[PDB]
Paper text:
Polyomaviruses are small double-stranded DNA (dsDNA) viruses with a circular genome of approximately 5,000 bp. All glycan-binding polyomaviruses analyzed to date engage oligosaccharide (glycan) structures featuring terminal sialic acids that in mammals are usually presented either on gangliosides, which are molecules composed of a glycosphingolipid, i.e., a ceramide and an oligosaccharide, or on glycoproteins, which contain mostly complex and branched oligosaccharides attached to amino acids during co- and posttranslational modification steps. These sialylated glycan structures interact with loop regions at the outer margin of the major [name], at the apical surface of the polyomavirus capsid, as revealed by X-ray crystallography and cryoelectron microscopy. The [name] surface exhibits an astonishing plasticity, providing virus-specific interactions for a range of Neu5Ac linkage types and further specific characteristics of Neu5Ac-containing glycans.
In order to enable an understanding of their structural features and receptor-binding strategies, we expressed and purified [name] pentamers of NJPyV and HPyV12 and solved X-ray structures of both native and liganded proteins. The two pentamers lack N- and C-terminal residues, which renders them assembly incompetent but does not affect the structure of the [name] surface loops and binding of sialylated ligands. As expected, both proteins feature the conserved jelly-roll fold typical for polyomavirus [name]. Our structure-based sequence analysis shows that the BC2 loop of HPyV12, which essentially mediates all interactions with Neu5Ac, is especially highly conserved in several animal viruses. In HPyV12 [name], the BC2 loop comprising the Neu5Ac-binding site is formed by amino acids T69 to Q83 (T73 to E87 in TSPyV [name]), whereas the putative binding sites in ShPyV [name], GhPyV [name], and FiPyV [name] include amino acid residues T61 to Q75, T57 to E71, and T58 to E72, respectively. Cα atoms of the BC2 loop (residues 67 to 82) from the liganded HPyV12 [name] structure superpose with the respective residues of the native structure with an RMSD of 0.3 Å (55), indicating that the Neu5Ac docks into a preformed binding pocket within the BC2 loop and that no conformational changes occur upon ligand binding.
Numbering used by the authors:
A (entry chain AAA): 29 to 37, 39 to 98, 105 to 299
B (entry chain BBB): 29 to 37, 39 to 98, 106 to 298
C (entry chain CCC): 30 to 37, 39 to 98, 105 to 298
D (entry chain EEE): 29 to 99, 105 to 298
E (entry chain DDD): 28 to 299
Amino acid sequence: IEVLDVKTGDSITQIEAFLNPRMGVNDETNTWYGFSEQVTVATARETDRPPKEQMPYYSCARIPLPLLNTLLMWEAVSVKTEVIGSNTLMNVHDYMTRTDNGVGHPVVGSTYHMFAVGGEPLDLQGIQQSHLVQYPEGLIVPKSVTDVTAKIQCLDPSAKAKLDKDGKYPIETWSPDPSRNENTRYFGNYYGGLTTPPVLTFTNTVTTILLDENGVGPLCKGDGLFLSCCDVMGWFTAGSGTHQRFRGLPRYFNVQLRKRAVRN
Amino acid sequence: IEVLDVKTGDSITQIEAFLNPRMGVNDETNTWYGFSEQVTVATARETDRPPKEQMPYYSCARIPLPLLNLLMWEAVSVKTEVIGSNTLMNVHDYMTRTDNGVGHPVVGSTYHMFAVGGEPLDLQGIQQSHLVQYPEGLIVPKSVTDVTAKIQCLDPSAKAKLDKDGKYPIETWSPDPSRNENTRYFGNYYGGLTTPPVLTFTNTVTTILLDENGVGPLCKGDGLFLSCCDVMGWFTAGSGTHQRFRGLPRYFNVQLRKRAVR
Amino acid sequence: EVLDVKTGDSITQIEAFLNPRMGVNDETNTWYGFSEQVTVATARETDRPPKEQMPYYSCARIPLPLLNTLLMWEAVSVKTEVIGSNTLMNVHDYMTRTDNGVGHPVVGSTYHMFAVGGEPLDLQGIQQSHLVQYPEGLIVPKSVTDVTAKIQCLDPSAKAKLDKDGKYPIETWSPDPSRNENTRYFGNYYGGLTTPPVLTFTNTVTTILLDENGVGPLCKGDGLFLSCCDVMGWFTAGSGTHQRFRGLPRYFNVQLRKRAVR
Amino acid sequence: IEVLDVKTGDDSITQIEAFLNPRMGVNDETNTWYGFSEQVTVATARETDRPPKEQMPYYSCARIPLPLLNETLLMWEAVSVKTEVIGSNTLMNVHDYMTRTDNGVGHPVVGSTYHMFAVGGEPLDLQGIQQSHLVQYPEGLIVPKSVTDVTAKIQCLDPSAKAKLDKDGKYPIETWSPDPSRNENTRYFGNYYGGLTTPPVLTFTNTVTTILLDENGVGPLCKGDGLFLSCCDVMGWFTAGSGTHQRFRGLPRYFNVQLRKRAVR
Amino acid sequence: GIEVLDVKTGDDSITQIEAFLNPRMGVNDETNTWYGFSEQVTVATARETDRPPKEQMPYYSCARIPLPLLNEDMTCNTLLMWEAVSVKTEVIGSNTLMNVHDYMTRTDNGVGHPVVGSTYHMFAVGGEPLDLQGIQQSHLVQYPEGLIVPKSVTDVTAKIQCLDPSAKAKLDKDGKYPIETWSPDPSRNENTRYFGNYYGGLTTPPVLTFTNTVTTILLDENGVGPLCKGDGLFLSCCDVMGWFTAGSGTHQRFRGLPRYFNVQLRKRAVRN
């Protein structure tokens, strides 16, 4: 594709969306929405059979764009994105673990943040901590696309997929593919540990540039804008025991798009 | 509004203000002002009934501005400071102690945010638990919409404006990134039970309030809207293991300029 | 009313070390550079700390060279260094020990601040507890105003100037961001009971003191006002579990230039 | 070489992509513990320290042959690289057969981390250095003993302990450092964070370019039309629920190197 | 003071000087089986009986590198000095701390406990020895014979626990100036650039970055680097990574790592 000049003047639009987290309890009518079910630990490598509701997933949405049609395409220039609800973790009166008469123990542990903006679905590369996990039916996992062997514990280049279903691609089996995603920008960070404190910043003043080194943003070839994210804040522990749940937060996107002339 | 040129020459004014923390003991005559009451923890998810004095709140105020009329005061920049980190170096108070060591200082989860705008801060409701029973006299998501499990994620019906000091609990309200066109907000959160608090302080740092088009917040009705919350963690008195939130005050020095608008 | 800088003669460097005032403020005392052992109150109403158990601000007024529309010395920039982090690598002293391991080094809360100005640092009073009974011979909020629960937040009547070395406790006084027009201050705080101390040192970093208009602090009466505090945490001697504040000295090298004024 | 001007236009730029798999000790892709070490055993004495090859992490390396460009000569010059450590998301699996506290989650991978990558026009130069001069390294590895007499000097800088990274999965990280006194024609980057239970930290993106040009605007020159990639990415230790024995866990690294044709004398 | 004139240009106006400085952690003898470590640290039974053996404390490393001779004709109204423009410096051997199979402390069947605790990194490049300011945690320590400590240069009193401006020395001997008694002096070192960082704690994880792509500029605010007096380049460092604990007990040893320097120098004219 030949990328020609930007249009000027009617030539800009803003697309906003909130994506809700898909932490395992993905049903908005369930009392534990925004969390996983209680995590259970395998008795052996060969008996590792996690239920769908115990794992966190990627969130994704395709936003329809105004129709345009040289050819014109919407070009994503920049995004303001925000993870909403760190303030909710300041609740330490809920039914939580307690030391003596101290406050309820807040959400802590491993965190995983990523967002992406693109003109087509996010490209995913499969990879697993254990090749022996028996994933439940009704997900997309590396077994969905290739023969799973010990190679999946490193880089098996046959384990390719696209993020095309909200709440069904587990984060534990799928990474953004750095060998593809020519038409997507993705950003993420991971911080491990069992009891690590979570960290978040929030503002409406920070713009993420989506232009590549040539000044070109993602091009929305199909009249669709693709938003993807995951925002795991750590584990919650209810006062009913020592079982833990993943806790995730929603993410806002406000994407600025401009009309770009193109030729095949 | 079509924004026109800035004025030059009496064209600039500074607004100086502070907001005291609203940590639950919000009465300046109470011996525990600047703290919450002792935090109690629910016996069940269905019996979670926190008293108003045990939770921290947003602070807010509207500063009246010189009447201009059109002209609007435009907020260009702010110097803001959280005052009092020095006070946490008191380890001789009636505090928990290991053997004959110092008093255990304030530690735990921190929540810092400030906002400067030309109208009240837009809030989005969100909660850790949809089953919490909030006390009478507060503004919570239940004040504006039916509260269901959707409130644990993003329920777009849970919209409010920060329009009362010490009444909007931080645990139920986020700054709304989908609104606040006429406000700049900034914040950071760090969790954990015993995490060390961190603060910087200086009079040399200016926060720019101009947007990408070089336009600051425009003060509707000649009012400047300031908002904040500065939770430093929990204090533990030597009388037991019960903990209290501890907050600190925030200073604002806002530079405003006159901006013509259509 | 600030006019043009002079050129050519027209620059001077002023150097000083300020020794820490950690409570043992007497350079002939064997515990100089430390506090006395910290005792913890038995009750909120019986909190009576001896002067030697609390850290203080350090300060000095450095007389300046002759230079006389008048001229004033304008502070352009400073190189400042906390000296002695290397001393904390001593783990063979009479210290707490785990089995046959090293002596437990200084850890805990840190408070660093420095200021350079043309008049004394303006201080705002604020306290963790309004009920502390401060000893005689200090300057505390009680020295300037009625102490009430308001002092746990911002009581704007609690104003003072840092005009005595080793007498203004850090636990009752913050640099005042509503004043200090003619001073630049910088500080950071990191809490916790056993947090590791962190320090950088170099002779290659210059702190600029010029404001947004290119004007540095102007030295009234030809005096340069330096202020600091550098608490590194607590030391624990092998004689028990009682702890002492440990502080380090700070070096300043301020570049001044001659400035014409009305 | 006298370095002359860059070439311009159609065909003057090429991109080389590769994934390098980690060599954590279990280096066989058919083994059920691929991407991990074998269970780490600790010496009973300084003089009985005999680690099996499968219990130690290694440098990964590959030489990628480049397009034909000659018939002044031209060399491919590495300008920049996008590199990514893949798979931090896999550490969010806390349901596997792992240690747990009461009914809490499986204890995830934690501990010491070692990240390094290098891009060059010849093999990475290595400097030998060891925690203990008394370790008895197993047959089939390349260690300082391979190139010099090992003495207590190896616990500091013994300048006789020089080697080139010329074999994947055979140079243990615990005996070899990138040599800052050589590597004129390679750029290397790394970070280390120690501790027994330290949380691992990783960022990932496709928007960050690492510039490989030196102070004179010259990148690594592929003197033999080969691009040399090297790395190690230790994430910490994994603990299986079968015991308290630990395994190193590593992750693969992606490289996408931009090269341009450079005239040389 | 040296009156600085123009930089020279062209062939042979530039040279690069490289060196490795080995750490001096207490076991300073390269033939000793614990080279690069301290002897096992012992803790005083009282403030008045604090008598540390010289092998139990880390020291500053230093070297003077000879430079090409510049000034054979001392009648000239202008002379030349080597000016240090920049340095690439690297602490080598963080990878060695990934050895957790050595004879080390262990929890159950877990890995050997690696080096952790307080870190102290510093390096300096100058045209004369690094200026040192004495300062101590305790004025009562009895230092062993054959070291240079504040007592070597002044009367040691409680003042030494803060800033005693009489405690001045120059870093002129490798492995003899303990880090616990000497700081780089910010009131001198006009002709040296120094850089350091300290992180405390008993079990803090050590942190290190390494690369060959980072240049440290040595030019001052006037564009002038250190000027090499007597055609000597002075390098100084210390790189304590924490404490090692052998499986023979709970006694701990300091562990240090070597540092590389590659200094770019240029000829600078000065008034004679």
